[PDB]
Amino acid sequence: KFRLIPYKQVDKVSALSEVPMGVEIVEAPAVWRASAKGAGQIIGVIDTGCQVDHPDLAERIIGGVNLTTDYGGDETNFSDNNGHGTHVAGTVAAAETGSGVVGVAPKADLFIIKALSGDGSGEMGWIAKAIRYAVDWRGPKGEQMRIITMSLGGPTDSEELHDAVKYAVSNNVSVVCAAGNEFAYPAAYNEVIAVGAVDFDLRLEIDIVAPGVGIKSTYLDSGYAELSGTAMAAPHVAGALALIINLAEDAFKRSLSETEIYAQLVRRATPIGFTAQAEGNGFLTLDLVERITGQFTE
């Protein structure tokens, strides 16, 4: 079956007051004015649920679903039973309460999808439904999700998963996945944005790399944990794309295809100097575009 990619649980803390370095190393501040801290965008978080009422999240969350047999499965109850969904949702979109933590898109909303049970597992139908479900949800304003993220890997290349992948990518949904540690799909899907990881010193088939070592975020019981692993990189990109859609679309005065946004993600990627099989397009440096604008060698 399909699982949560494995990771070290470096620390559980009760109360933090910082911008997790992951966030600011990727240069999310620099770009928050232009992207409205991501306001307007809805990241669909496909994981283990969430602490709906967690103090950093609750106001960034607009609904969700539960495709897992857990608790019921009562469709209307996706409140986390693991702490991943939480940690992840927090990296993508923790708000500026003047407290705790704040993620890459402290303004993008979240739609919580729980296709993963408390042990971490999921059946593949649950995850293919997770993605399809991402695509089709429209809120009260008919508002829509354009970004989807998972930190899961399956060995079983099924058609059904792929039909959904292409279905999501076919309608302007960016689908973001952490690149496995066996743990291959959906990440080995060429249409998916596959994220691998580096630490803060920028040491380590993928598209980009983002931070994954010693990253703090939300955890269960209004808690906080610090996680090291390959699954922690992806959520930084999901967040990032939220700020990329706002800032791109504003610039081109026009809506953009996800192929055009994939473009836009990868140009906010600086290479580190490992070859491209090792680092894809590079490290996510959000502000790259401004730094290089006026620049030519004579």
* One-letter amino acid for residue 100 of the chain: G
Residue 230 CB, nearest approach to a copy of itself (Å): 19
Chain breaks in the chain (C to N over 2.5 A) after: 181, 204
Residue 100 binds which entry of Na ion, a copy of itself, none, CB below 5-8 Å type-dependent = Na ion
Which positions lie near Na ion, rule CB under 5 A?
56, 97, 99-100, 102
Nearer to a copy of itself, 58 or 289 (CB): 289
Nearer to Na ion, 103 or 212 (CB): 103
Nearer to a copy of itself, 27 or 226 (CB): 27
Q: How far apart are CA 69 and CA 59, in angstroms?
A: 27
Nearer to a copy of itself, 30 or 52 (CB): 30
Residue 61 CB, nearest approach to Na ion (Å): 14
52 DSSP assignment: T
Nearer to a copy of itself, 123 or 249 (CB): 249
Which positions lie near a copy of itself, rule CB under 8 A?
27, 190-191, 202, 205, 207, 248, 251-254, 257, 259-260, 262-267, 269-273, 275-277, 280-281, 283, 285, 287-289, 291-297
Residue 55 CB, nearest approach to Na ion (Å): 7
Distance of CA 195 to the CA centre of its chain: 9
Q: Write phi, then psi, for 269 (nearest 5 degrees).
A: -115, 125
Residue 56 binds which entry of a copy of itself, Na ion, none, CB below 5-8 Å type-dependent = Na ion
**CA-based angle 55:56:58, to the nearest 5?**
70
The gap between the terminal CA atoms of the chain, to the nearest Å, is: 56
Q: How far apart are CA 150 and CA 134, in angstroms?
A: 12
